[PDB]
Amino acid sequence: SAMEDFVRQCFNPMIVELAEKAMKEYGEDPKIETNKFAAICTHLEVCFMYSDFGHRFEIIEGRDRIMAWTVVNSICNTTGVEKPKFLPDLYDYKENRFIEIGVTRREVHIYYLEKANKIKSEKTHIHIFSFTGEEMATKADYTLDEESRARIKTRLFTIRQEMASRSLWDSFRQSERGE
């Protein structure tokens, strides 16, 4: 499958290795579930960019369940913020809130509604990015400055265009794996 080669060519080896772990540890083959592989890579990269564009952010995503829950519990004990039922992706120290990052191939409002209905906890802030350069955040609070969100949007659009240049974007968009 060309999707695997595209993933290995456009994503950092660290991100690819983390995605391979998240998949093979839980019984999934990145050679079979290629769309999910690409989606996990993209989501991890977006989370890491979000965090780097802050210090201000503590990355929960990219860790094993043990370490992620350890970090969440430590943040809850220090700041007193309520413990999320589902592992969020980041913690904002400035705004003092957990953040769930979503990357979708569908409309941002549909994915935002799905995410909100999933995590029935208003305190976890939701930020949805799309591959067409659109975003949607809880209360329209995008947390980051314009430049950081622009960089993330450019990266996402570039991933989509690279997929399209290899005739991979149609299969990826018509699939909902990873969201």
Whether 89 sits among the annotated catalytic residues: the reply is yes
- The distance of closest approach from Cβ of residue 115 to ligand T6U in the complex, given in angstroms and rounded to an integer, is 8
Q: How far is the CB of 39 from ligand T6U (least distance, A)?
A: 8
101 or 159: CB nearest Mn ion: 101
C-alpha dist (Å) from residue 149 to 86, 116, 134, 141, 170: 25, 21, 10, 12, 25
Stretch 23-82 residues interacting with ligand T6U (CB under 6 A): 43, 61
Q: Which of residues 78-137 bind ligand T6U (CB under 6 A)?
A: 87, 89, 102
Determine which one of 36, 92, 100, 115 is catalytic: 115
In degrees and rounded to multiples of 5, residue 21 shows phi and psi of -65, -55
92, interface contact from Mn ion, ligand T6U, none, CB < 5-8 Å by kind: none
* Residues counted in the chain: 179
Residue with tokens 């913690």: 91
Q: Which is catalytic among the residues 36, 45, 89, 92?
A: 89
Check residue 92 for interaction with Mn ion (CB under 5 A).
no
> DSSP strand E in 80-140: where?
90-92, 97-104, 125-130, 135-137
- Type of residue at 84: P
How many other β-carbons are positioned within 10 Å of the β-carbon of residue 76?
A: 15
List interacting residues with ligand T6U (CB under 6 A): 43, 61, 87, 89, 102, 178
List interacting residues with Mn ion (CB under 5 A): 61, 89, 101
